[PDB]
Write a protein that binds this DNA or RNA. Structure first.
Lengths: 62, 84, 64, 111, 134
RNA sequence: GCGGUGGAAACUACCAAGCUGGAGUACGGUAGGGGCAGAGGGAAUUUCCGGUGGAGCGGUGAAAUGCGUAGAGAUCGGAAAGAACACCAACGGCGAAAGCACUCUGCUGGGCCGACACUGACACUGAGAGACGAAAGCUAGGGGAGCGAAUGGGAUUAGAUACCCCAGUAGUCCUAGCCGUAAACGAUGGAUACUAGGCGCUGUGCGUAUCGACCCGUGCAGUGUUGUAGCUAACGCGUUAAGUAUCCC
């Protein structure tokens, strides 16, 4: 299941970001946010590598 | 849990205290450790060995320590005097 | 030994105080002969009971 | 009986020691601030049972409201096996620091 | 399952018999099957057996020995790769080497299949030299 | 060498379609000084305030400067202050490294293990780039007990800007930044696959044993110590290689 990985990582970045911006100095979870961004980004380049229209739907969903 | 023997020896210069210890619910073999002629601590060495065991109950550790203490005590008095 | 099934809490002052000395200080794993897990868990529990003044931080020296 | 409700929120247990003097408004008023916690928490709040007063090791420093007087050797050992949301535990800490008959209140989180 | 499936088999051969163990377990892909097919028939090894473990067909391969010696195999096997991934090598039917005069062979990928120097020198075809053993 | 043209399809590439052991996710556990924030703690030290008592205390290789009849130090009580957190502490656990240990709470990272529960190669490395990055340093504001560069005095010394001693400022701590270096060391970039063992530790999993804690073997992951092969100029390293190979800087 791929779109649950992208969507799940998106909610991960939402909850972790609204953690981090009202907190502002945790330099440990910064790596977690950046590993999630990079991991999701290699997924988006993967599904963009496979398809057009379907990845256009992944952009249009979020 | 078997039960226990300190053996002391007094010769004028030198104490030895020798702690022979015994088994808990876990089958173990102690020696008798003999603590030695130089001024290096006998009670601390003995008691610490017992505490390191936990295999020794408090009553057991204490009774042997009391006997050990008594001999070190007699030894100190004889060394300060000449008893022999 | 003496795990006794129920977990070690600050409320269990039976197996705790078998682990401190009468001088009131924590004994190591090789003396108490437990696992690492038992040792750390009684460590945190003993220091909790140290906060609640159930246990002294120092016991006054005595002779005779 | 306790694993019924912890789909949704958390579980705690607060240890709080008391004055040794008063016998009235001690089981009463601290249960009334437990009802203040009931306005806050509202979960399976049971087993708030009391433990007998015994001599502790060493304690000073009551800090009454402008008293700063009483040393102690004894104290009533309350412990609340309560159950609440993880939100609003710091106001339980302020409630169990600021009040007079509660000194040295350490909460915990049993698993 | 690393980068190479041929340094897979080959490094399992070198690491197999440099510790004198006469038994190899490797994956059985198409080109591994072809190499052990053109390698059992050339006297280097003894037997290759396919089987399965979790329905994954593998090759266990029995190496050669001799009798009870200081080391029970005298001639050290000396396997070597040539066409590394990232540096492909290619030869005509001129460059195709007689290894040590012929005591080694150079297994290589023709358009026919994969041959040796005997079976690609008579053909006159050339191709990508996988590796040569000696 | 380049070009034209006719053939081959194993390998790289391509086109299409499946596959799962690579990689992830979902789930259930699990361990942790991972990080940050908030509360709370008690020894000890210093200073002040009282009661006592009266001549030294402190320091050293030996002394001295200092402090002390204005009552020192010592002892008991009373406050206040900041900083660090004894035993536990282990050849231990975690982090990517630097680092991280008084306890508790909150938010949150990461790891490990199982079942096929899912997708189907999504992988590795990474120029330039970006982040973090011990200590000392600097800007701004707090705070300042101990320690303590510079400094000052005493001593040793031919001399002493030094080792010793007595005072002692910046600094040490915290807030917000800058700085971006260290023997930042495992003096060992990362990743995958394969190649004896013994003795260990940590985390989980299965079976035995009891039916419950053990206890034995093990499946893995991580950490350590001797060590075969092989490598090495040697010392040594040796499944966590400095071995055999492949890739990337």
């Amino acid at each position: 299941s791929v779109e649950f990985q992208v969507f799940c990582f998106t909610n991960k970045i939402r909850r972790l970001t609204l953690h981090l911006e009202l907190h502002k100095k945790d330099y440990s979870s910064q790596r977690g946010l950046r590993k999630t961004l990079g991991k999701r980004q290699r997924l988006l380049a993967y599904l963009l590598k496979i398809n057009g229209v379907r990845y256009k739907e992944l952009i249009s969903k979020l | 849990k078997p039960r226990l023997v300190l053996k002391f020896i007094w010769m004028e210069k030198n104490i030895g205290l020798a702690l022979d210890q015994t088994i808990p619910g876990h089958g173990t073999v102690p020696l008798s450790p003999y603590y030695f002629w130089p001024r290096k601590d006998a009670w601390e060495e003995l008691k610490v060995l017992l505490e390191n065991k936990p295999w020794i109950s408090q009553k057991q550790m204490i009774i042997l320590l009391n006997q050990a203490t008594d001999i070190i005590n007699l030894w100190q008095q004889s060394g300060g005097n000449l008893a022999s | 030994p003496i795990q006794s099934g129920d977990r070690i809490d600050y409320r269990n002052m039976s197996l705790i105080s078998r682990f401190i000395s009468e001088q009131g200080k924590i004994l190591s794993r090789r003396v108490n002969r437990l696992t690492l897990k038992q040792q750390r868990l009684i460590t945190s529990a003993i220091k909790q009971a140290r906060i609640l003044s159930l246990l002294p931080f120092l016991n006054n020296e005595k002779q005779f | 009986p306790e694993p019924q409700c912890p789909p949704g929120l958390r579980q705690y247990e607060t240890m709080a020691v008391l004055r040794p003097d008063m016998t009235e408004d001690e089981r009463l008023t601290l249960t009334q601030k437990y009802e203040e916690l009931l306005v806050a928490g509202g979960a399976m709040y049971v087993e708030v049972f009391n433990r007998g007063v015994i001599p502790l090791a060493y304690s000073i420093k009551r800090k009454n409201k402008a008293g700063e007087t009483n040393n102690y050797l004894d104290g009533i050992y309350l412990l609340f096996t309560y159950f609440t949301k993880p939100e609003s535990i710091s106001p339980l800490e302020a409630a169990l620091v600021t009040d007079d008959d509660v000194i040295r209140s350490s909460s915990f989180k049993i698993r | 399952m690393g980068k190479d499936t041929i340094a897979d088999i080959i490094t399992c051969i070198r690491n197999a018999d440099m510790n004198r163990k006469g038994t190899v377990r490797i994956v059985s892909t198409n080109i591994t099957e072809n190499i052990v097919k053109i390698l059992l028939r050339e006297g280097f090894i003894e037997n290759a057996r396919k089987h399965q473990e979790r329905n994954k067909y593998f090759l266990v391969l029995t190496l050669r020995h001799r009798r009870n010696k200081k080391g029970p195999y005298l001639n050290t096997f000396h396997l070597k790769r040539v066409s590394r991934p990232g540096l492909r090598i290619y030869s005509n039917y001129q460059r195709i080497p007689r290894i040590l005069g012929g005591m080694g062979i150079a297994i290589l990928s023709t358009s026919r299949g994969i041959m040796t120097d005997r079976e690609a020198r008579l053909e006159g075809i050339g191709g990508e030299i996988l590796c040569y053993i000696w």
